[PDB]
Structures are given as structure tokens and as C-alpha cells.
Amino acid sequence: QDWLTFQKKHITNTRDVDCDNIMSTNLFHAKDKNTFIYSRPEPVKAICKGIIASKNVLTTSEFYLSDCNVTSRPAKYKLKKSTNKFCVTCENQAPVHFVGVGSC
Numbered sequence: 001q002d003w004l005t006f007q008k009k010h011i012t013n014t015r016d017v018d019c020d021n022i023m024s025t026n027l028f029h030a031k032d033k034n035t036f037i038y039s040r041p042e043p044v045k046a047i048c049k050g051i052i053a054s055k056n057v058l059t060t061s062e063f064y065l066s067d068c069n070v071t072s073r074p075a076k077y078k079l080k081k082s083t084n085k086f087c088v089t090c091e092n093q094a095p096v097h098f099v100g101v102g103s104c
Contacts, residue, residue: 003045003094010098011044012036012066019068019077030075035101037086038064048090056104059085065101 089097
């Protein structure tokens with residue numbers, strides 16, 4: 001919804017996201033998936049430089065990603081690390097939504 005929330009939901013300072021821990025918190029409400037970008041915030045914000053009206057943007061660079069994917073046991077997850085492009089909604093020069101991996 002906004003850059004502050006995007007950071008909380010989708011930027012991780014550790015590649016080893018503690019899935020079973022963090023996914024159970026209110027912010028994620030035990031949902032079945034969440035993609036985290038392992039990066040300091042400024043280079044992620046830079047993706048959206050100059051873009052005013054809401055627009056989805058696919059990164060031209062690949063980034064380190066950490067996914068928390070649910071197992072067959074509700075709320076145990078598997079952490080999967082990968083490298084890929086991702087799509088974000090840019091608005092007023094900042095990412096405000098994570099759209100998906102690999103494509104808009």
C-alpha cells in the first residue's frame with residue numbers, strides 16, 4: 001500500500017528468513033506464501049525512480065529472493081532461496097506493492 005509497508009512485507013535483511021516464525025505474525029497472518037527480497041532498501045527503492053502514476057515495473061537486474069512456501073502442515077514452511085527479476089507497483093517514485101516474480 002505504501003513504501004513503509006512494502007519494506008516490512010517484502011524486504012528482508014537476512015536471506016535466512018525465519019519462515020515459521022515471521023509468517024505466523026499479524027503482518028502475514030499464516031498465509032501460504034510470501035516472497036522476500038534480500039537487499040538493503042535504497043537499491044530496491046531506486047527501481048521506481050521517476051515514476052509518478054501507479055505503474056508495474058519489472059526489474060532489469062536479478063535480485064536475491066527468499067520465499068516462505070507452506071508445507072502440507074499449516075503454518076510449517078520451507079524456505080527457498082533463488083535469484084530472479086521481480087515486478088513491483090511503483091507509485092510516486094517508490095515501490096508500494098509486490099506483484100510477482102519473473103514477470104508483471
